[PDB]
Design a protein around this ligand. Structure first.
Ligand SMILES: CCc1onc(C)c1-c1cc(F)cc(C(=O)NC[C@@H](N)C(=O)O)c1
Ligand SMILES: N[C@@H](CCC(=O)O)C(=O)O
Lengths: 275, 275
């Protein structure tokens, strides 16, 4: 059982999805094949797999694991939600794909937290992350724990801040800071790109989100206007099914890459910034 | 139950002090009037009762209360972290103690790496850090690539701690063969001795855990760290592969990052303002 169904999700620079050379339907070298299921219409379960091409930091990790641990894979993009959220006690997203056995593993910008570890096994972390805050340079806030976020209406004017809902960041704020959570829902953003535009154009004062992605974006920012000022340190991990026989070797391989220098090379390749 | 815990002396994770004459620990208080929790720990193999506290001890107490267990703590008999040495091969230090049954859990700033994980189970990281270099304040160095480390001599002395993961890495790595030949003559038995040695100009540079070194530098104004972090990695709780505790130990650590408890430990033990 060496041929593994593996689910991922687009999030640059961890996973980047591009269109396949339309003449050849062949993925250029340095990218791997990935499929996405695309519905014919909204009144039907009918749809077709579109052949795409995948690259990025996590993709490269996958290629390394594939060689070291000796499996082949069929990669696909999740279509039922994003990273993972429990809805009416049912997991969607990549986590869902693993919990309900449609995938052997999930690879990508997938944060390790307690509630997800209850339902999946996680590898060792291979990218360090947590919750950060991105602001326009000059903005004075101490961090997630500041009273400008915790008690926003103590101040005049109240800070405008938000996140992308339905991921690990929002889950964490919901459990820890109930007043902050309900205030923020007004400013929640569809995605990171929307959020950066809001920041740059004075429509948002702060954006709270995954630390790994924010650091990357800050480092690539035109002008170095957007800066980050890490709460709940964790990391990204490979998600596997509970009691997975692949966990042992994957963990060892990931730790080998840290000690070999292979991880440092990937970091330089993909996550280097100017700022 | 009744878990045997091995740990090691290493401020600010584990302070080790004499019991008073009656067999109890000196009542002590943080600024704020909060009681410093202390445990009786036996250590040297003529063993005597002693007093242990700090970040790792608070974590253990947290863990013991959460998962409902009782424990006895001892300091590792040989004073060492643990490497696998030729006799055909055997672990010393806390690694050896855990593998033989002398301990059931290692609760200590024990670095997670490939070689140890082949033999033991590590929790998810309770702390994220890396390596850096501690020098006396006079000294300006680039870091691990500065010529004075790269082309060594008797006119600038550098070292690490023996039977650490860092020591046996320098021994095994081909490009490090010349640095080892220098460090072989200067490596110390303990981090504390090495740190003192730097204060007195008997050692020019000490390569060690950033969590420990940055702490030292925050407390003593005649010390500083230099270079960027390198070999970013974590500390983990160590358990045998068939420990029945491993799931809940890992879940508890994740919970404690997510709910602020670990950041609490960092404010108490790690983030000091003496410099
Ligand atoms: C992936 C980890 C790794 O791989 N190769 C080397 C070298 C390291 C590494 C990184 C670090 F930040 C601290 C120590 C260490 O040995 N510290 C001393 C002590 N905590 C210990 O556990 O022995 C070792
Ligand atoms: N990396 C997060 C998604 C982004 C976030 O919510 O910070 C997760 O796996 O849910």
């Amino acid at each position: 059982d060496n041929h593994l169904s593996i689910v991922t999700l687009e999030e640059a620079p961890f996973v980047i999805v591009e269109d396949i050379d339309p003449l050849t339907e062949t993925c250029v070298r340095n990218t791997v094949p990935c499929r996405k299921f695309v519905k014919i219409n909204n009144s039907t379960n009918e749809g077709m797999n579109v052949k795409k091409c995948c690259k990025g930091f996590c993709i490269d990790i996958l290629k390394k694991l594939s060689r070291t641990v000796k499996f082949t894979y069929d990669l696909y993009l999740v279509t039922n939600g994003k990273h993972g959220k429990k809805v009416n006690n049912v997991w969607n997203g990549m986590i869902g794909e693993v919990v309900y056995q449609r995938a052997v593993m999930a690879v990508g910008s997938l944060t390790i937290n307690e509630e997800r570890s209850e339902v999946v096994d996680f590898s060792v972390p291979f990218v360090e992350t947590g919750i950060s805050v991105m602001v326009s340079r000059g903005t004075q806030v101490t961090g997630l724990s500041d009273k400008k976020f915790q008690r926003p209406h103590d101040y005049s004017p109240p800070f405008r801040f938000g996140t992308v809902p339905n991921g690990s960041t929002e889950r964490n704020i919901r459990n820890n800071y109930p007043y902050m959570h309900q205030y923020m829902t007004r400013f929640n953003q569809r995605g990171v790109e929307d959020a950066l535009v809001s920041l740059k154009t004075g429509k948002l004062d702060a954006f709270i989100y995954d630390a790994a992605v924010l650091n990357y974006k800050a480092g690539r920012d035109e002008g170095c206007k957007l800066v980050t000022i890490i709460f709940a340190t964790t990391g990204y991990g490979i998600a596997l099914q509970k009691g997975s026989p692949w966990k042992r070797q994957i963990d060892l391989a990931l730790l080998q890459f840290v000690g070999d220098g292979e991880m440092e090379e990937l970091e330089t390749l993909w996550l280097t910034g100017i700022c | 139950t009744r878990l045997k815990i091995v740990t090691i002396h290493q401020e600010p994770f584990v302070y080790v002090k004499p019991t008073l004459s009656d067999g109890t620990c000196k009542e002590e208080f943080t600024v704020n009037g909060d009681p410093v929790k202390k445990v009786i720990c036996t250590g040297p193999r003529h063993t005597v009762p002693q007093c242990c506290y700090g970040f790792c001890i608070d974590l253990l107490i947290k863990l013991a209360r959460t998962m409902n267990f009782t424990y006895e703590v001892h300091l590792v008999a040989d004073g060492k972290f643990g490497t696998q040495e030729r006799v055909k091969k055997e672990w010393n230090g806390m690694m050896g103690e855990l593998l033989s049954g002398q301990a059931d859990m290692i609760v200590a700033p024990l670095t997670i790496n490939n070689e140890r994980a082949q033999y033991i189970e590590f929790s998810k990281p309770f702390k994220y850090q890396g390596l850096t270099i501690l020098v006396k304040k006079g000294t300006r160095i680039t870091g691990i690539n500065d010529p004075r480390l790269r082309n060594p001599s008797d006119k600038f002395i550098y070292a690490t701690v023996k039977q650490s993961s860092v020591d046996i890495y320098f021994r095994r790595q081909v490009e490090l063969s010349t640095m080892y030949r220098h460090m072989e003559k200067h490596n110390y038995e303990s981090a504390a001795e090495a740190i003192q040695a730097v204060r007195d100009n008997k050692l020019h540079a000490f390569i060690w855990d950033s969590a420990v070194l940055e702490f030292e530098a925050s407390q003593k104004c005649d010390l500083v760290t230099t270079g960027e972090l390198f070999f970013r990695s974590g500390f983990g709780i160590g358990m045998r592969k068939d420990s029945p505790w491993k799931q809940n130990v890992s879940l508890s650590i994740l919970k404690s990052h997510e709910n602020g408890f670990m950041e609490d430990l960092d404010k108490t033990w790690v983030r000091y303002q003496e410099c």
